Amino acid sequence: DTVEGYTVFGPPKPGDSKAFLDIALSIASQNVSPTRVSVWDIKIPDMT
Numbered sequence: 001d002t003v004e005g006y007t008v009f010g011p012p013k014p015g016d017s018k019a020f021l022d023i024a025l026s027i028a029s030q031n032v033s034p035t036r037v038s039v040w041d042i043k044i045p046d047m048t
Contacts, residue, residue, distance in 0.1 A: 012018045
């Protein structure tokens, strides 16, 4: 430890949210985001 073990970096403090990264990565799922109709194609409703 005296040579190899010791490092300046320490464990994260509470509220760091680094502690929740790699729990973030497990949940991480890619999004499809399917193609939508263009706003130009959509006809704006009439309220008269």
